[PDB]
Structure 1
């Protein structure tokens, strides 16, 4: 039933644009929406990746490796899956492994890769691949993980046991001002509900 009639540009920055979207509703009435899009998406299957990094070590409970960063849109620190935009020509798996090493120091192994999933579909066209990666924490490569952050990237690594993820997140939120990402929270909640 529904389709896009037109996309009018309102304002274009270096990274993000706003559009006036005109569409057909299922009654045959024409309507509008205000849409956010990134300016950086070329031939990539998605804007970005987020990495679910499962750190595995013998005689340790598995951990989910998270990162804490200052996020200017939010005006504060956020705890998220390691994540970044996919470079032109890069595969989602390659962007995931690259971002994970850059942000955390870990060299992971691909486990699975989602289709393009939407970040906030009521507002933006932004998509990511959610890529699950296992990190062999017994490998010497992963002993003293050294992050190699890019220009303007400032990251703290936080590894939390998978078996207690939601309580350990609540305990960090209780101790300082800091926002957990919706994807991390959704993942932690499902680990509880299962």
Structure 2
């Protein structure tokens, strides 16, 4: 019933562009929307985000998150490890690569989502959510070395899975960080389960 008629370029940067989208509303009336897109899409999606389950015997299972300065937010955010998918890279490979560069951990793929949208009222941006386990008892994950690319500066924060929502709430209250909505949604569901 609804569909895109045309897209008008408004402004194109190196990384991001803004378009004016014309679309048919379901009454047969023509309407416009201000839409954001990345200029980098090739890929199944723009990016990947990794849900990294750190498994160490005799410890609680942890979810590994990252903290970085985010210029659009003007502050520090707590997020799943994540990055854009390289041209000709599979989402699974992007997931292990980004996880290693951002955290130093070497993980194994558990499952991979379909492309999912980030903020569909605003942008066309999509990601694959890739669940990865990390065997924290393996020697390669003993002293995990983060490999920050040029212009990346990432702190690693591992939080127990069974208390994740309360641990995040505490970080927000004391550290004045912004938690990512996907991470928050994951944490809420861990509490809402059963």
Deviations 1:145-191 (A, max 9, x none): 01001000000000000000000001111112110000000000000
Deviations 1:26-82 (A, max 9, x none): 00000000000000001x000000000000011111000000000000000000000
**TM-score calculated relative to the size of structure 2:** 0.99
Secondary structure class of the residue paired with 1:152: coil
**TM-score calculated relative to the size of structure 1:** 0.99
Q: CA deviation at 1:3?
A: 0.4
* 5+ long unaligned stretches in structure 2: none
Deviations 1:78-131 (A, max 9, x none): 000000000000000000000000000000000000000000000000000000
Cross-structure match for 2:93? 94
User: What do you get for the CA RMSD once the two structures are aligned?
Assistant: 0.4
Structure 1 runs of 4+ with >6 Å offset:
none
Q: Distance in 2 between matches of 1:144 and 1:174?
A: 30
Secondary structure class of the residue paired with 2:159: strand
Number of positions where the alignment pairs a residue of Structure 1 with one of Structure 2:
193
Cross-structure match for 1:62? 61
Q: Distance in 1 between matches of 2:121 and 2:149?
A: 31
